[PDB]
């Protein structure tokens, strides 16, 4: 039964109606599986059926409950970003805005030109890691 619809498009990523609701949503960046099983329960809907069985009325509510999480009483610590830095607030970042935000913080750390941006620009590991036996790839030997 329930032949009504299948694969659909939502914001910035195409989501299949093939998979279960929570796991389907995770494909959108800035949303993990842990972030989705919350947001579905705040929306007060089943997670025990497929994503192709949601109606347009329902999914319209999903994105609102997602993009104003503080106003639907999901805690601040449970967000991606707490006080971004130089923006002054708690925030939740989703697919195409995530990349834009990310590229800024790279640019910032070469603006000031800390140790960070130099390691980024040289293409070497940021965090405390040995590079002597790591990475390889490689070739060109003596």
């Amino acid at each position: 039964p329930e032949k009504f619809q299948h694969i659909l498009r939502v914001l910035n990523t195409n989501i299949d109606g093939r998979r279960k609701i929570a796991f389907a949503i995770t494909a959108i960046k800035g949303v993990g599986r842990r972030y989705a099983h919350v947001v579905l329960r705040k929306a007060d809907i089943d997670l025990t059926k497929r994503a192709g069985e949601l109606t347009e009325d329902e999914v319209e509510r999903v994105i609102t409950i997602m993009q104003n999480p503080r106003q639907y009483k999901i805690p601040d610590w449970f967000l991606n970003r707490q006080k971004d830095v130089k923006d002054g607030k708690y925030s939740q970042v989703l697919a195409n805005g995530l990349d834009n935000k990310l590229r800024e913080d790279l640019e910032r750390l070469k603006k000031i030109r800390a140790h960070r941006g130099l390691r980024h620009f040289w293409g070497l590991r940021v965090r405390g890691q040995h590079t002597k036996t790591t990475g390889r790839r490689g070739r060109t030997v003596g």
């Binding site: 039964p1 329930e2 032949k3 299948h6 093939r18 497929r50 192709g52």
Partner: protein, 75 residues
């Protein structure tokens, strides 16, 4: 790995075959329903639960990782 796809919703033909496989089959597990039809294993799980409510099949054994079903005990 291979490429394969299964149906995650029911159709006409799935339901009709589902009613007629019963007297012909001694073993019915969701795995065997996966092969004889093109249907997902969790879909096939619940499809057999429906039949048991009708009394077409009979449960004979149960486990976490398996469920077994039999005909009508008419041979």
């Amino acid at each position: 790995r291979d490429k394969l796809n299964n149906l995650v919703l029911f159709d006409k033909a799935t339901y009709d075959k589902l009613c007629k496989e019963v007297p012909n089959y001694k073993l019915i597990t969701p795995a065997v329903v996966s092969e004889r039809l093109k249907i997902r294993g969790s879909l096939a799980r619940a499809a057999l639960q429906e039949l048991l409510s009708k009394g077409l099949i009979k449960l004979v054994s149960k486990h976490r990782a398996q469920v077994i079903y039999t005909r009508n005990t008419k041979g």
